[PDB]
Amino acid sequence: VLIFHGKPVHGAIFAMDGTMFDTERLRFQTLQQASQELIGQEFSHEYLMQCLGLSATTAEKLAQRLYGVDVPYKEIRKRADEMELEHIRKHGVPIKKGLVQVLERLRKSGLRMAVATSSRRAIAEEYLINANVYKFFDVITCGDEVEQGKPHPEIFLKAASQLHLDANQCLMFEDSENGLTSAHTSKGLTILLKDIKEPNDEMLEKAHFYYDQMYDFLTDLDQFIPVMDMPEMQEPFPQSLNQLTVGIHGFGAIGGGYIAQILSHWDGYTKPKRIIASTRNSLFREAVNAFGTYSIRYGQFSYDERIENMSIVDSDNEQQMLEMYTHSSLIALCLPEQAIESESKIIAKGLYARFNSQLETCIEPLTFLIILNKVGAKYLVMKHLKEALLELTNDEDVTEHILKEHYFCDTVVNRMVSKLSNQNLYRQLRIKHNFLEQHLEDVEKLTPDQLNQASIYVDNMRRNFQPGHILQSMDLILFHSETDMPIYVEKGSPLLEKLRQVVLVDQITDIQLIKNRLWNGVHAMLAWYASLMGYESIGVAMGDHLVKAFAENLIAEVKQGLAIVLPNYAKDLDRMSQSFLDSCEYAFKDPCQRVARDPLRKLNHNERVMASIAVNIRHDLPYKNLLKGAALGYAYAIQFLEIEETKAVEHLQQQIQNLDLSTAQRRQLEAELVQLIQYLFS
């Protein structure tokens, strides 16, 4: 049962104009233009304000009081409605920000829903179908269907009666003083949203709850509806689109093959209407924009996940990058460490444009996710961003205001993704182009007035849509990824509170430590073992029984010490361990060289190998596989990276001396480690 502010709610009834849609402001202009053309004067602001919530019949009676019994209101209204339907035909129904997010929350909560509007059925059905919100309502009650319109309670009492609920079990959404009175008298749980009239004390008194805008009600409603569970593999994305735009700065492997799935799942109720991703790969950009979508292939389940509403922009195109930072609510920076410095100038330009623009998107702060498998990624990005903003604005006050306005969130990503090579994309485009060519070979009770009009609609639609019919079973595969779902994100941004694929953490350091030791540690040691055994990738190495056994034992050893050091992360350790082993199995596009790089840095006392050894020695847990991994590291540095034996031993003795162990444990470790290194050289 949906509980809202202590009250059990079973239904929700909405006023349409001014509450769901921003159509009262447009109607003010059409009625003013139609009255100017017919009675030589515009309808006053006072008359049009008094009309809010009234049906065309009651608004006609009000026009006869102020302008005279012979006022041609029916002719003025008819002309205004025609101009209004023409504006809606050219630009669409202006939907109040957050409406579909609210509707999907109430629908998924099991509420019976209705519209109670003073507008006539024809206009109401036009706007509800045009805005694609008609599907959310069981009942529609209109102004031309009630004897006593607003402020009389009849229309709300009738909508509640048609939903088979008492008015007091219904939330009633209103914007006008007349409408609010109708809903309040009916006995509904009134929710007043500000539209044109600044609510007076009488409106604020009878309203059960008041919000300045639909988004503010959405924020309150979120406290009464749950955060959806972590998505499963193959679970579909939400159908409904909200009005938000999200951005992926860097359409590489993790951005396209992972962040896009996170952003497409959004909160489970709705998903962004547009995802802007930036890349310098022209082939990738043009391919996505030709299809409108791309797909992520998950080899394990042979499942192609389609990422809809994608828009790929050129990274070097200043105007497209400004649009991403000006229209987006969330931006995920998915750049390599090498690109941070040069890209910070583009991030600065976009954040400065967001600061200067007067749009209704730049008012809310931006949530900036920093996606980088490096400890201190947030600090590296923030330092470069501050430098770039300072030289661009040449104003310390503007720079500080920008860096304090937004939520810069550090993250822990575990999913392994591989971006398709340009040669493989080219081959895919060549094969699917021939399919498109073959598809083009195969395809080559109404009045007569509207039956001929329908023939034009259907012909124009068949001509434009037919070539794209092949997209029903044709995907643009761009990424091959693993099945790891959760992204660990720093808590703080309120925009992250409902994202179902995000795991919020108060401090990111604990899951960063787990990532470093359990994931990166076992990965670097597995790469050193595989490099010395002659394998060029982890996936090929996993074919060797001794390599697969080493990986299973090495992760079981690290996890054992981590379960004691961080018992609050016990389930995460079990999940990440199996995730690592599953992702290592067929990792053919994961070369050993990149994973085994910088072995002396990875063999430091506080790094991914020696720190786990010290923990297992301090808690009397086995460490033979961890010792073998450390020995493989020093052997790899000497045999492959040409590091002198004298420097490897000097580094070995320095890190062991830095470890928090007894003198006996340090000596035993040093002797066992040097013994294994000498044994490897045979």
Q: DSSP letters of 567-594?
A: GGGHHHHHHHHHHHHHHHHT-TTSBHHH
Contacting residues toward ligand 44H, per CB under 6 A:
15-19, 24, 27, 31, 48, 51-54, 59, 117-119, 176, 179
Restricting to residues 239-258, name those near a second copy by CB under 8 A.
239, 241
377 binds, among ligand 44H, Mg ion, a second copy, none (CB under 5 to 8 A by kind): Mg ion
Among 405, 497, 552, 672, indicate the residue that binds Cl ion (CB under 5 A).
Answer: 405
Under the binding rule (CB under 8 A), the answer on residue 25 touching a second copy is: no
Smallest distance from a second copy to CB 240, Å = 8
Under the binding rule (CB under 8 A), the answer on residue 233 touching a second copy is: no
Under the binding rule (CB under 8 A), the answer on residue 548 touching a second copy is: yes
59 binds, among Cl ion, ligand 44H, a second copy, none (CB under 5 to 8 A by kind): ligand 44H
586 binds, among Cl ion, ligand 44H, a second copy, none (CB under 5 to 8 A by kind): a second copy
Residues with Cβ within 8 Å of 356's Cβ and at least 6 positions away in sequence, in order, are none
Query: What whole-number distance in Å separates Cα of residue 493 and Cα of residue 10?
Result: 31
Under the binding rule (CB under 8 A), the answer on residue 164 touching a second copy is: yes
Query: What whole-number distance in Å separates Cα of residue 162 and Cα of residue 112?
Result: 10
Residues with Cβ within 8 Å of 678's Cβ and at least 6 positions away in sequence, in order, are none
Query: What whole-number distance in Å separates Cα of residue 302 and Cα of residue 527?
Result: 27
Query: What whole-number distance in Å separates Cα of residue 71 and Cα of residue 357?
Result: 44
Smallest distance from a second copy to CB 181, Å = 25
Q: How many CB atoms lie within 10 A of CB 310?
A: 22
Among 141, 243, 264, 311, indicate the residue that binds Cl ion (CB under 5 A).
Answer: 243
48 binds, among Cl ion, ligand 44H, Mg ion, none (CB under 5 to 8 A by kind): ligand 44H
Under the binding rule (CB under 8 A), the answer on residue 107 touching a second copy is: yes
117 binds, among Cl ion, ligand 44H, Mg ion, none (CB under 5 to 8 A by kind): ligand 44H
465 binds, among Cl ion, ligand 44H, a second copy, none (CB under 5 to 8 A by kind): a second copy
Among 282, 342, 509, 578, indicate the residue that binds a second copy (CB under 8 A).
Answer: 282
Q: How many CB atoms lie within 10 A of CB 315?
A: 23
Query: What is the CB-side half-sphere exposure of residue 531 using CA atoms within 13 A?
Result: 26
Nearest CB to Mg ion, comparing residues 30 and 411 = 411
622 binds, among Mg ion, ligand 44H, a second copy, none (CB under 5 to 8 A by kind): none
Among 466, 483, 658, 665, indicate the residue that binds a second copy (CB under 8 A).
Answer: 466
Element (H, E) at 287: helix 282-291
431 binds, among Mg ion, ligand 44H, a second copy, none (CB under 5 to 8 A by kind): a second copy
Nearest CB to Mg ion, comparing residues 101 and 411 = 411
Query: What whole-number distance in Å separates Cα of residue 364 and Cα of residue 213?
Result: 13
Structure tokens at 481: 């990824």
Among 82, 212, 220, 304, indicate the residue that binds a second copy (CB under 8 A).
Answer: 304
Stretch that binds a second copy, among 41-49, 292-300, 403-411, 495-503 (CB under 8 A): 292-300
Restricting to residues 444-463, name those near a second copy by CB under 8 A.
445-446, 450-451, 453-455, 457-462
Query: What whole-number distance in Å separates Cα of residue 498 and Cα of residue 629?
Result: 41
Residues with Cβ within 8 Å of 567's Cβ and at least 6 positions away in sequence, in order, are none
242 binds, among a second copy, Cl ion, Mg ion, none (CB under 5 to 8 A by kind): Cl ion
Task: Quickly tell me which residue has 């049906």 as its tokens.
Answer: 55
Task: Quickly tell me which residue has 């750049």 as its tokens.
Answer: 335
**Nearest residue to 5 (alpha-carbon basis) of 215, 211, 208, 219:** 208
Nearest CB to ligand 44H, comparing residues 101 and 119 = 119
**Nearest residue to 288 (alpha-carbon basis) of 303, 275, 297, 298:** 275
Helix locations, 310-339, DSSP H: 318-327
Among 23, 141, 242, 261, indicate the residue that binds Cl ion (CB under 5 A).
Answer: 242
Restricting to residues 87-106, name those near Cl ion by CB under 5 A.
98, 101
Residues in contact with Mg ion, shown as a per-residue x/- string from 386 to 415 under the rule CB under 5 A: ------------------------xx----
Under the binding rule (CB under 5 A), the answer on residue 511 touching Mg ion is: no
Among 64, 293, 342, 654, indicate the residue that binds a second copy (CB under 8 A).
Answer: 293
293 binds, among Cl ion, a second copy, ligand 44H, none (CB under 5 to 8 A by kind): a second copy
Under the binding rule (CB under 8 A), the answer on residue 229 touching a second copy is: no
N-to-C CA span, the chain:
71
Smallest distance from a second copy to CB 184, Å = 22
Residues in contact with a second copy, shown as a per-residue x/- string from 308 to 347 under the rule CB under 8 A: xx--------------------------------------
Nearest CB to a second copy, comparing residues 195 and 267 = 267
**Nearest residue to 196 (alpha-carbon basis) of 52, 374, 345:** 52
Longest dimension (CA), the chain: 110
Q: Contact, 541 vs 513, CB < 8 A?
A: no
Q: How many CB atoms lie within 10 A of CB 264?
A: 23
Query: What whole-number distance in Å separates Cα of residue 221 and Cα of residue 639?
Result: 62
**Torsional sign, CA 347, 352, 356, 361:** positive
Smallest distance from ligand 44H to CB 105, Å = 21
**Nearest residue to 178 (alpha-carbon basis) of 158, 192, 157:** 192
**Torsional sign, CA 356, 362, 365, 371:** negative
Amino acid identity at 287: A
Query: What whole-number distance in Å separates Cα of residue 463 and Cα of residue 446?
Result: 23
Nearest CB to Cl ion, comparing residues 96 and 602 = 96
Nearest CB to Mg ion, comparing residues 100 and 370 = 370
Give the distance from CA 440 to its chain's centroid. Answer: 36
Smallest distance from Mg ion to CB 370, Å = 6
Smallest distance from Mg ion to CB 523, Å = 16
Restricting to residues 320-379, name those near Mg ion by CB under 5 A.
372, 377
Element (H, E) at 140: strand 139-142
551 binds, among ligand 44H, Mg ion, Cl ion, none (CB under 5 to 8 A by kind): none
445 binds, among ligand 44H, a second copy, Cl ion, none (CB under 5 to 8 A by kind): a second copy
Residues with Cβ within 8 Å of 129's Cβ and at least 6 positions away in sequence, in order, are none
Surface-to-core class of residue 314, CB atoms within 10 Å of its CB (0-12 exposed, 13-18 middle, 19+ buried):
middle
> Is residue 151 reached through a cis peptide bond, with omega within 30 degrees of 0 on the bond before it?
yes
Total residues in contact with a second copy, by rule CB under 8 A: 87
Under the binding rule (CB under 8 A), the answer on residue 564 touching a second copy is: no
Residues counted in the chain: 682
Restricting to residues 643-672, name those near a second copy by CB under 8 A.
none
Smallest distance from a second copy to CB 174, Å = 22
292: region left, alpha or beta (phi > 0 left; psi from -120 to 50 alpha): left
Smallest distance from ligand 44H to CB 88, Å = 13
Under the binding rule (CB under 8 A), the answer on residue 427 touching a second copy is: yes
Residues contributing to the site for Cl ion (CB under 5 A): 98, 101, 242-243, 355, 405
Residues contributing to the site for Mg ion (CB under 5 A): 372, 377, 410-411
